[PDB]
Amino acid sequence: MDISKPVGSEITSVDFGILTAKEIRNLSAKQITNPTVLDNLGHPVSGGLYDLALGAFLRNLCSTCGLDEKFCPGHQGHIELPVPCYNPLFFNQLYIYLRASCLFCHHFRLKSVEVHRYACKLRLLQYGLIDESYKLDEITLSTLLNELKSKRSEYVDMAIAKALSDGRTTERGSFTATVNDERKKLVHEFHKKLLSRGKCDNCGMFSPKFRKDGFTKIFETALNEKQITNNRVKGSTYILSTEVKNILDTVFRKEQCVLQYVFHSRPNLSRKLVKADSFFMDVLVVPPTRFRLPSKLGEEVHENSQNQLLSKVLTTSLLIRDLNDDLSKLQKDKVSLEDRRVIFSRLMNAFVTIQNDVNAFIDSTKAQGRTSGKVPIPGVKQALEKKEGLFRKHMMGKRVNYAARSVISPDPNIETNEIGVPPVFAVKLTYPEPVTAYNIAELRQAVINGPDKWPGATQIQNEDGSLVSLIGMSVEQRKALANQLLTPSSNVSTHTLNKKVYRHIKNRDVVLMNRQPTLHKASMMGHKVRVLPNEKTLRLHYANTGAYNADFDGDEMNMHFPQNENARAEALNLANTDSQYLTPTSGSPVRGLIQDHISAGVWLTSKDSF
Amino acid sequence: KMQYFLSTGNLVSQSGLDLQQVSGYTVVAEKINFYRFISHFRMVHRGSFFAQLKTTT
Amino acid sequence: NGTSNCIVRVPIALYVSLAPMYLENPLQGVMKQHLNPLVMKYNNKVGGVVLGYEGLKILDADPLSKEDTSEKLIKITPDTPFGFTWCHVNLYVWQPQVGDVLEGYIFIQSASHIGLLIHDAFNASGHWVDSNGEPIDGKLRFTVRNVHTTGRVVSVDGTLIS
Amino acid sequence: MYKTEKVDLALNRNRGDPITQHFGFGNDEWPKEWLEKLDEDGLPYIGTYVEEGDPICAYFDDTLNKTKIKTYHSSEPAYIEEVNLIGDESNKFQELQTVSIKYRIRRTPQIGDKF
Amino acid sequence: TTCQFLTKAVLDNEREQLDSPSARIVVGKLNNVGTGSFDVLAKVPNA
Amino acid sequence: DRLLNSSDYTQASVCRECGSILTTQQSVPRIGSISTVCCRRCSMRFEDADSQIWEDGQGNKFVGGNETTTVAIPFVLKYLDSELSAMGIRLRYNVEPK
Amino acid sequence: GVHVSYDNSIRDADGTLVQFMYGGDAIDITKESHMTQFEFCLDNYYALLKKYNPSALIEHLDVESALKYSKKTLKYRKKHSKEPHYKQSVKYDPVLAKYNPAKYLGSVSENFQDKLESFLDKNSKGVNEKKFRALMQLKYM
Amino acid sequence: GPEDFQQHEQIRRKTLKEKAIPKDQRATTPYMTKYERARILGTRALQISMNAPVFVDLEGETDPLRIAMKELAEKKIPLVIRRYLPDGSFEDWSVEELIVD
Amino acid sequence: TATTLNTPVVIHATQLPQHVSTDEVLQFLESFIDEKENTNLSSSISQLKRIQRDFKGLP
DNA sequence: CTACCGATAAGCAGATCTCTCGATTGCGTATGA
DNA sequence: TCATACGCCTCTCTGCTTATCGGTAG
RNA sequence: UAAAUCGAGAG
Numbered sequence A: 001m002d003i004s005k006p007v008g009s010e011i012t013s014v015d016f017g018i019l020t021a022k023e024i025r026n027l028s029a030k031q032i033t034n035p036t037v038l039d040n041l042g043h044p045v046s047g048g049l050y051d052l053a054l055g056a057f058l059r060n061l062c063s064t065c066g067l068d069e070k071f072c073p074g075h076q077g078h079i080e081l082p083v084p085c086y087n088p089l090f091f092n093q094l095y096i097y098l099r100a101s102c103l104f105c106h107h108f109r110l111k112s113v114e115v116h117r118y119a120c121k122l123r124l125l126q127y128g129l130i131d132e133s134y135k136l137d138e139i140t141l142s143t144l145l146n147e148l149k150s151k152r153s154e155y156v157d158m159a160i161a162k163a164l165s166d167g168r169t170t171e172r173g174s175f176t177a178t179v180n181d182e183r184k185k186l187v188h189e190f191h192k193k194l195l196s197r198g199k200c201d202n203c204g205m206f207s208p209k210f211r212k213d214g215f216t217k218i219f220e221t222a223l224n225e226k227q228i229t230n231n232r233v234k235g236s237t238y239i240l241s242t243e244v245k246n247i248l249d250t251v252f253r254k255e256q257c258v259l260q261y262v263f264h265s266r267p268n269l270s271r272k273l274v275k276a277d278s279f280f281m282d283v284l285v286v287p288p289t290r291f292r293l294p295s296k297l298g299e300e301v302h303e304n305s306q307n308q309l310l311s312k313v314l315t316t317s318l319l320i321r322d323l324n325d326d327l328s329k330l331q332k333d334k335v336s337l338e339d340r341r342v343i344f345s346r347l348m349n350a351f352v353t354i355q356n357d358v359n360a361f362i363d364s365t366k367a368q369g370r371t372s373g374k375v376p377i378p379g380v381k382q383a384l385e386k387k388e389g390l391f392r393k394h395m396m397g398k399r400v401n402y403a404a405r406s407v408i409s410p411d412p413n414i415e416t417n418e419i420g421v422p423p424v425f426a427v428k429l430t431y432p433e434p435v436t437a438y439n440i441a442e443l444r445q446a447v448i449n450g451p452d453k454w455p456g457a458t459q460i461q462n463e464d465g466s467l468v469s470l471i472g473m474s475v476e477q478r479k480a481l482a483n484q485l486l487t488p489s490s491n492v493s494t495h496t497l498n499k500k501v502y503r504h505i506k507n508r509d510v511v512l513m514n515r516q517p518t519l520h521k522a523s524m525m526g527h528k529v530r531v532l533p534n535e536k537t538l539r540l541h542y543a544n545t546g547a548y549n550a551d552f553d554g555d556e557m558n559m560h561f562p563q564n565e566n567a568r569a570e571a572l573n574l575a576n577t578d579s580q581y582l583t584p585t586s587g588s589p590v591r592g593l594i595q596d597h598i599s600a601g602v603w604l605t606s607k608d609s610f
Numbered sequence B: 001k002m003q004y005f006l007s008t009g010n011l012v013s014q015s016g017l018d019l020q021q022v023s024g025y026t027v028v029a030e031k032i033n034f035y036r037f038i039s040h041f042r043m044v045h046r047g048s049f050f051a052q053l054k055t056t057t
Numbered sequence C: 001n002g003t004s005n006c007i008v009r010v011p012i013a014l015y016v017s018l019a020p021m022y023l024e025n026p027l028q029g030v031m032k033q034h035l036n037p038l039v040m041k042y043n044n045k046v047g048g049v050v051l052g053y054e055g056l057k058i059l060d061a062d063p064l065s066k067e068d069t070s071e072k073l074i075k076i077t078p079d080t081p082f083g084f085t086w087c088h089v090n091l092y093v094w095q096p097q098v099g100d101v102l103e104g105y106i107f108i109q110s111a112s113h114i115g116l117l118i119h120d121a122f123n124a125s126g127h128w129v130d131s132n133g134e135p136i137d138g139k140l141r142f143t144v145r146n147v148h149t150t151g152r153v154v155s156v157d158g159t160l161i162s
Numbered sequence D: 001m002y003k004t005e006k007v008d009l010a011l012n013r014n015r016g017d018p019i020t021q022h023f024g025f026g027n028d029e030w031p032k033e034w035l036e037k038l039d040e041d042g043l044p045y046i047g048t049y050v051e052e053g054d055p056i057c058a059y060f061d062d063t064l065n066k067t068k069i070k071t072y073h074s075s076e077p078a079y080i081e082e083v084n085l086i087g088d089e090s091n092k093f094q095e096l097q098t099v100s101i102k103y104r105i106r107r108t109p110q111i112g113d114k115f
Numbered sequence E: 001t002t003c004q005f006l007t008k009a010v011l012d013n014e015r016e017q018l019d020s021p022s023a024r025i026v027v028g029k030l031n032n033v034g035t036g037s038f039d040v041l042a043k044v045p046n047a
Numbered sequence F: 001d002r003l004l005n006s007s008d009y010t011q012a013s014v015c016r017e018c019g020s021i022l023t024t025q026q027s028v029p030r031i032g033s034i035s036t037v038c039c040r041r042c043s044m045r046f047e048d049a050d051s052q053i054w055e056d057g058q059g060n061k062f063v064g065g066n067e068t069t070t071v072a073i074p075f076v077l078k079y080l081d082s083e084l085s086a087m088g089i090r091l092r093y094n095v096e097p098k
Numbered sequence G: 001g002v003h004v005s006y007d008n009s010i011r012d013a014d015g016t017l018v019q020f021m022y023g024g025d026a027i028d029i030t031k032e033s034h035m036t037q038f039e040f041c042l043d044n045y046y047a048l049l050k051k052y053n054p055s056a057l058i059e060h061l062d063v064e065s066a067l068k069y070s071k072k073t074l075k076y077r078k079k080h081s082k083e084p085h086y087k088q089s090v091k092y093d094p095v096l097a098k099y100n101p102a103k104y105l106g107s108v109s110e111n112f113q114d115k116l117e118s119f120l121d122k123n124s125k126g127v128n129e130k131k132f133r134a135l136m137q138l139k140y141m
Numbered sequence H: 001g002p003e004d005f006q007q008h009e010q011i012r013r014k015t016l017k018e019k020a021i022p023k024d025q026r027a028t029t030p031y032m033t034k035y036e037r038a039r040i041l042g043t044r045a046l047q048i049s050m051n052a053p054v055f056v057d058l059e060g061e062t063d064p065l066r067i068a069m070k071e072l073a074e075k076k077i078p079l080v081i082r083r084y085l086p087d088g089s090f091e092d093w094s095v096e097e098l099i100v101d
Numbered sequence I: 001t002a003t004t005l006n007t008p009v010v011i012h013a014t015q016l017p018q019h020v021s022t023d024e025v026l027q028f029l030e031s032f033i034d035e036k037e038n039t040n041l042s043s044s045i046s047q048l049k050r051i052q053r054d055f056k057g058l059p
Numbered sequence J: 001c002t003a004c005c006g007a008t009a010a011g012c013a014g015a016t017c018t019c020t021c022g023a024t025t026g027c028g029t030a031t032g033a
Numbered sequence K: 001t002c003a004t005a006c007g008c009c010t011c012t013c014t015g016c017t018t019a020t021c022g023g024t025a026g
Numbered sequence L: 001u002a003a004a005u006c007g008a009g010a011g
């Protein structure tokens, strides 16, 4: 971070959502078709996974933004799946909604009055009326049902209206932990009740019972002998993704009233209708080439696992597209039943294998098919889930710049609040001091001294982000640069800025000094720095050992160097070792001399000593 | 095949040889010091299967 | 000119950043940081090239303060000493409109393009025979059917026919 | 400290393609300072101080038509102890391809060294 | 269970206001505990 | 300072209305123009519609959508958002000075 | 996420309240060490008074209301001490509930006030009980 | 220039004004907390390092943090602290009224 | 360039455009430079001095 | 009599600090040489 | 005769969730 | 310059 580069805009809040097929088609820069990442020559191939419209590759300029590899942000692309595919994340919701539904009247198997009551309760809980939701149940009081629907709706309308006017809730809806818990309990009970009772009461017709074998195949069972009797009185096949999508799309269109409140924890200010074509992905989004770059040894080049999965995706898609084309000619040129039947069975197997393929691409565990294998390629879910996943390893904790680590050795000659910084660390760790009227002499001397003689400077960052390194500069060049340190900036845009000198860590600085495991606050304090020019160990006073729980033992502990004034003033005051005299566990002190100072005091304070 | 077994430690068999573990069968005879070297030849292992269970008995 | 003022005063509400060195002189700091560069530059949001400004104001971050207080509050970002604040200022912007009549002189004449200078400050793009035979001069009424603004300075193109 | 590293030139042409990289010096304009740590046959002199950025061996490649050098890859200064030329068991009397280089680093007791 | 909690948050369009330290760390915002539990204003003496 | 300012600090552009970080991109100037940052999802193709239109690198012309700002975010956040987009999940980021 | 707010009530990051007071007294565990050491405080009264400087902590403080309510509540509890736990109908809530301990001198805990009064009654000692009580109330603040 | 921005600005300022707690009824600690002191010192040091005007006598001092501490000792820091309450309301204390330690 | 140091983050126009009143721009043109010089070296005055006299006389 | 409602029995899914080195990377097969 | 690209090639804890055997009113 | 598995270690 550069304190000379202020940022005005802020990310106030983040809301999750589902990508629609239309926007990604409008968003994407190219459509990936062939499953050939690299040709014989290794040059990127148009339409492949490494197309130049997905980000600059190696030395190739990106064909979308016209920027080099270091300057190209990486533009996303998309692929076109032949058959709509179940999203493996939302497959449980797909199963729950496919069950507990009627295929004839295209409503839920629950009563319309019951689903209306649940929708009213959820709408009340949207704004936080956790009490009016329970008070709505006592409005029980064929033709009167239409009145009962209005009476509950009228009660809901005024309950929100009185709550918004007096200030109990804004138009965005109040969302707290307890209303979230009540909403979750209500939704769980609603789903359990939905899945419970058959015999759809809207039209009184039994419906087939579905079943699943894995996360890719779904089968249904026809009605039994007693069940097939009552179907006509009113007057284990394999189901297809397209037809389940159509069924759920029509059901959602019919039951928007309840689905909107089931699918929203806040009032739907956007008014956008929820659609069943959200659990089905007809388009996959390929991460840019920057995030799919290939691994590189000195010579041993290994393919990207995501690229392998996407290439297998594209191979299956091309096979399905070619089979469908062959299916067309076998129909215009009419043939026997089996001639089309064999390739239709092959096409169904291809649908199943592409479903399993997308399941493998998203989730490694959901993949099916392994005889011997070597290692099952992790899905995108596996890249974000476990302790080694993206979250717990790359945002809950990151590798840090400007930080050192070494073995600790004792030093009773530092002021019980300082750290013994070896001269090897003192010439690498720097701080970006901006030049001023009062800093000019010290920073000029540091620049003249250079990156090798402590105290000294390694870089001179100009006003316009230009970093001038002092590693390969002679004494005369460094003297000229020090002379040109503080000069009036000619550029109008950079007239409010001054050069920054990356001075070495002087004696006045403060560092964060930490030992693992950090079991409490005291195991990470901020010590002042004392530059001891002898050897290469971090030298620590003897009082801190009690809190750090280390011995001079081969023990090692890190030393982080904060790089801005807020962190300096806040490690010198809030995190400094003086303020940690008493641990918050019980208020008992944690510092003090340890082993031979106690015996020296016992011998010195005895009255036998004159 | 035997050279691969020696250089990697993994045991590739179609029967299992009545042995619970699969990998970690060969260790490098390190020669940092003669005590280490001679200790390599007298040591025994309960098995890599016993390096994860929490029963301390 | 063509019985059109073409000089429109458009107030704006701009979010700016104030340098730490402009703390005891904040309004002048804001004007010299942001408003001065906008002079004689085409800005699409305001409508056209800005001629100047007057009536700069700083929106206080303490709402309970008066509207005439001489000590206002600027919000300092956590990561940077620079301060960000809203502002109100009236922009005097030249606002040409397409399809209208504009009067401009001619300064540089070429074989193909005619250099029309509206008030000698609107760049655009060897006597010959005209419809009436009069030598080509600077005073003429041209059309604004096509406007060029990809370059550093906006330009206009057109023909005598409407 | 004794450390050895193997300079296996025949690690990129792992196929049956003939030798395209030979130890030694080419005929291009390679710097003359490379001869202060390297012999005439593109090999390090015994008992030589090698630090970070210092040439270790010089190889000539017939394709790039340039004289490239491998480099020492440790910040700890070392001495060249032994250089071995390993032959090929194959009947083809190939040129010198794989070379073993051994380093010697003085580990004098500084503070922090466990006793 | 990053997968399970992601579906439970995306099904109902759970908008989060970045209040817990984990969310602020993910989005790279200044924390709300300690020295980040308040703002800082500047008293500029304009005309 | 330990987690963002000195690890993966990036001043990535962001779209104000779509609330997406990697949907934005840079434009290609014609002559003496400026490569303004534009949003791909915001921009409409010129078929369905100077200093009003911007082109891609392949010659396509997109109109509108040229409003965006800069925010200070970690790069791992951008990678996570890309991974989520691979899952069919969209993250929308609300920018304060709208 | 749970942290001390500016109401002296600790609560989670979103805003849900967990406690109205940190432990019921809102005193730091680190600084609690020498709030019961009445003998030590009496011995180093002069040093502690020089450290605290009550003279400069008057124009921004209210001293009378909290002390009056504390005395009233203390007399109420002493009168009603010999009562069952459930029968002790609450008429005067603890002074910490109403008066901010960081702005009203004398708005201390029931335990701390009881200990201070017991010490001042059992130990009859230039320092008088009034100045010592004021110093220790400032120490609690 | 639409009223579809004037209305948003007006409602934003109205909400901000309703959020602010008047000076006559703020009921927070008159003392300056350690976090507030540290943040004030850090921000003032940042401003000084970025060439902001100073008011104290620079008696041979080169550390912006030390200059900030000197200004805080002299109570000449021109900064206002916006203490935030859980609901969103804020009280605008300044370093002058706040008393240290 | 085009950073947060010389360009506004947001430049939304608060109200509708309004033409110049009182029929004289000299109520601002004569006072624009009066508050300016009584840097900006990008022909900010050189090409700005050619728009004031034309409405008054001849260049 | 029989459907809604529970009360187990069983299965299923998810869990159980940092740092430094070294070593290693598949069979199997099937056709153009 | 015989080499590299294509095609795959068995001893711990907490819940939740679904299915199935008993009961009550209508 | 990579990435995974196994093995040996330090606190």
Ligand SMILES: Nc1ncnc2c1ncn2[C@@H]1O[C@H](COP(=O)(O)CP(=O)(O)OP(=O)(O)O)[C@@H](O)[C@H]1O
Binding pocket: A516, A517, A549, A550, A551, L011
């Ligand atoms: N699994 C583990 N996790 C964390 N720390 C560990 C550890 N195993 C060993 N250590 C470290 O090993 C060191 C052993 O120190 P301790 O046994 O706790 C004090 P001690 O018993 O008085 O040692 P002493 O007998 O040499 O005087 C600790 O510093 C500890 O941090």
Ligand SMILES: [Mg+2]
Binding pocket: A549, A550, A551, A552, A553, A554, A555
């Ligand atoms: Mg130790």
Ligand SMILES: [Zn+2]
Binding pocket: A053, A054, A055, A056, A062, A063, A064, A065, A066, A067, A072, A073, A074, A075
């Ligand atoms: Zn690109």
Ligand SMILES: [Zn+2]
Binding pocket: A102, A103, A104, A105, A106, A107, A200, A201, A202, A203, A204, A205
């Ligand atoms: Zn039905």
Ligand SMILES: [Zn+2]
Binding pocket: F015, F016, F017, F018, F019, F023, F039, F040, F041, F042, F043, F065
């Ligand atoms: Zn957009």
